[PDB]
């Protein structure tokens, strides 16, 4: 099927870029779109055969080529803030004979006017309350990720070292903090709901993970703070019970019992040696 | 094709339509785009009638000049965007803009409440949470400029066959409590604001008690030491009655 | 990358500790402290260290078709044999000590006299 590369990308005003489209089922002709709120899919360029290209609907600033019969990249000459969009690639068999189009997965781009606005996120996990555990006998956990620009995150839950997919609902759209300014940061939340007798174990391990996509190792940085790159931020918790008797206090009870019985057994062997020696010396004094 | 999100309750017939005046097209199809993903083909018809693929059904009226689509027995997994497209015999297909759909689930036992979740000791926020609703409740954005409200979402837990509605509020400032957080929204009577007089059940904590193998071995070593003490103490009683009787 | 290609794979349901070798090959050989300890073909890709209550240490390596990799030092201290010094521990200790020394001394008093 159609695949394309990359997924997320950040660049500054006046910087070139090339992104790949690929195909593997011997079709011949391909396209490029861009999708915006209120407009939908608008065509940019296309190429009816290996060697020939055509123009579309919004072609300003896009130079294409067709070298092989499976490849069709797309170049930006210089970047402008109006290039901020989502780009797709399609494919058809042969000139309307079989009109099944296959689209790609997407590629999100943002153009900023300065690289001093990129920020990584901050993650926190908030443990469930006791009134829910006693009222409905289920428990909910909340993950919050705040204050990141641009909006290029992916969030997941991990219980005992493995991903879960059941019992999770994440927001569709990242909110804005103040929606009045131009460069404004975002936030995003997520939930996991679990039965009560699964959170009460002090043996289960819960965590929330965020994958951020940012800068790279080719970029100038003359700012004081660290360089915001592609990294993973996370936050954890052990399950915990408040009242009652767990398997954390049983172990303490058993440890103190073994050391007390070791001491007491040593004292009893001392007394056995004493009265044995007394009976032997009396046995000598009988003779 | 008209935009604007429409609501259909769970398990009914849905009616979508596009009007294409004026041309004479041959080929017709429908696409579906979820959140943050790419379009996907459902159905591909170019003769007047019905080309069924399950619970999906298209129709074309030629001289009346519209297409249509019926979905039946709908679940909350159909919330997406539908895009009708067409072409002539040559290239360059023509799309609409798209129609947003939301399906709301069945809410068999409601019990609305607002809970205060425990803090984090590494950030200085506090979260209130407004759980299961009845799906007729609307949740409204915040009055202030320092209080953040999210929309309502639907989660699904398959280990109990249970589904539910939620909404989350959070803020930095002081004088923030869960009795004054969801003030701007309409709210039902007889929700449940709790009191901080805690109630932890004790027979419920015992239902989650695991066991290692190290703990089994330590309990058998205690049961060894106790038999050794009883035997050596018996020997001490015998010898001291021997010296005490003479 | 810098020839660091050994990793730790933790937090499983049982207390096991597993190591992974990030080299593209079949038939990976392992090492601890410079000497060979194991052997592992395909359909198993992780060396098992055992439960973490035995708290392993040491320095591990793995090789494939190219040269060896740089070591990794592991150090678990998950204490599991610790007693906390509270009111209840010290009162239990002193109560057992008092009653034992009293009974023993009464017995020696009647053996002597």
């Amino acid at each position: 099927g159609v695949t394309q590369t990359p997924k997320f990308q950040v660049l500054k005003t006046g910087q070139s870029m090339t992104l790949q489209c690929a195909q593997d089922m011997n079709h011949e002709y391909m396209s490029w779109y861009r999708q915006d709120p209120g407009m939908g899919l608008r065509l940019i360029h296309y190429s009816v055969g290996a060697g020939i290209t055509d123009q579309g609907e919004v072609p300003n600033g896009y130079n294409v080529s067709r070298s092989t019969t499976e490849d069709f990249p797309l170049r930006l000459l210089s970047a402008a803030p109006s290039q901020t969009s989502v780009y797709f690639c399609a494919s058809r068999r042969r000139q309307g004979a079989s009109g099944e189009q296959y689209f790609g997965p997407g590629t999100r781009l943002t153009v900023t006017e300065d690289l001093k606005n990129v920020f990584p996120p901050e993650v926190a996990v908030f443990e469930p309350s006791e009134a829910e555990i006693s009222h409905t006998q289920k428990a909910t956990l909340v993950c919050l990720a705040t204050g990141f620009y641009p909006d290029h995150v992916e969030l997941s839950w991990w219980v005992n070292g493995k991903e879960v997919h059941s019992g999770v609902s994440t927001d569709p759209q990242p909110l804005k903090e103040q929606p009045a300014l131009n460069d404004s940061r975002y936030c995003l939340s997520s939930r996991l709901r679990v039965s009560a007798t699964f959170w009460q174990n002090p043996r289960n391990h819960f965590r929330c993970q965020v994958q951020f996509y940012g800068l790279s190792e080719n970029d100038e940085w003359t700012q004081d703070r660290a360089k915001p790159v592609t990294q993973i931020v996370s936050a954890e918790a052990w399950g915990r019970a408040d009242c009652g008797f767990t398997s954390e206090s049983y172990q303490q009870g058993v440890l103190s019992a073994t050391i007390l019985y070791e001491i007491l057994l040593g004292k009893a062997t001392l007394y056995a040696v004493l009265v044995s020696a007394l009976v032997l010396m009396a046995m000598v004094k009988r003779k | 094709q008209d935009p604007g999100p429409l609501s259909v309750p769970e398990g009914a017939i849905v009616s979508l339509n596009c009007t294409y005046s004026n041309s004479a097209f041959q080929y017709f199809m429908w696409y579906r785009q979820y959140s943050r993903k790419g379009p996907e083909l459902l159905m591909y018809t170019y003769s007047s009638g019905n080309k069924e693929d399950g619970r999906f059904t298209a129709q074309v009226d030629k001289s009346s000049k519209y297409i249509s689509l019926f979905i039946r027995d709908s679940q909350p997994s159909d919330s997406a965007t539908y895009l009708c497209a067409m072409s002539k015999g040559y290239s360059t297909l023509t799309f609409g803009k798209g129609t947003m759909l939301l399906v709301s689930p069945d809410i068999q036992n409601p019990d609305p409440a607002v809970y205060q979740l425990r803090d984090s000791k590494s950030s200085d926020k506090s979260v209130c949470l407004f759980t299961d609703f009845d799906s007729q409740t609307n949740v409204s954005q915040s009055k202030d400029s320092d209080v953040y409200i999210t929309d309502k979402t639907v989660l699904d837990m398959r280990s109990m066959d249970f589904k539910s509605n939620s909404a989350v509020a959070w803020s930095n400032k002081s004088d923030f409590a869960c009795a004054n957080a969801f003030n701007n929204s309409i709210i039902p009577e007889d929700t449940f604001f709790p009191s901080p007089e805690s109630s932890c059940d004790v027979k419920l904590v015992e239902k989650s008690f695991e066991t290692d193998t190290n703990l089994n071995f330590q309990n058998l070593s205690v049961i060894g030491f106790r038999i050794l003490l009883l035997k050596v103490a018996g020997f001490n009683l015998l010898m001291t009655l021997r010296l005490w009787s003479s | 990358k810098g020839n660091h290609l050994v990793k730790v794979y933790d937090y499983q349901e049982d207390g096991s500790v597993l190591l992974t070798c990030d080299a593209e090959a079949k038939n990976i050989t392992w090492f601890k402290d410079g000497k060979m300890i194991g052997f592992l073909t395909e359909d198993k890709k992780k060396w098992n260290l055992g439960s973490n209550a035995k708290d392993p240490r040491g320095m591990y390596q793995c090789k494939g078709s190219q040269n060896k990799s740089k070591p990794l030092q592991v150090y678990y201290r998950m204490c599991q044999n610790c007693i906390e010094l509270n009111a209840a521990t010290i009162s239990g200790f002193l109560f057992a000590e008092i009653v034992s020394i009293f009974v023993l001394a009464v017995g020696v008093y009647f053996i002597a006299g």
Binding site: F245, V254, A257 | F209 | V103
Partner: peptide
């Protein structure tokens, strides 16, 4: 109960009883 402190404390009483009663027994006979 699962808590073993009542099991260890329940034999601490029977030990002291078994000392007292034999002491009185050898005081009589």
């Amino acid at each position: 109960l699962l808590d073993p402190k009542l099991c260890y404390l329940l034999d601490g009483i029977l030990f002291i009883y078994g000392v007292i009663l034999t002491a009185l027994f050898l005081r009589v006979k």
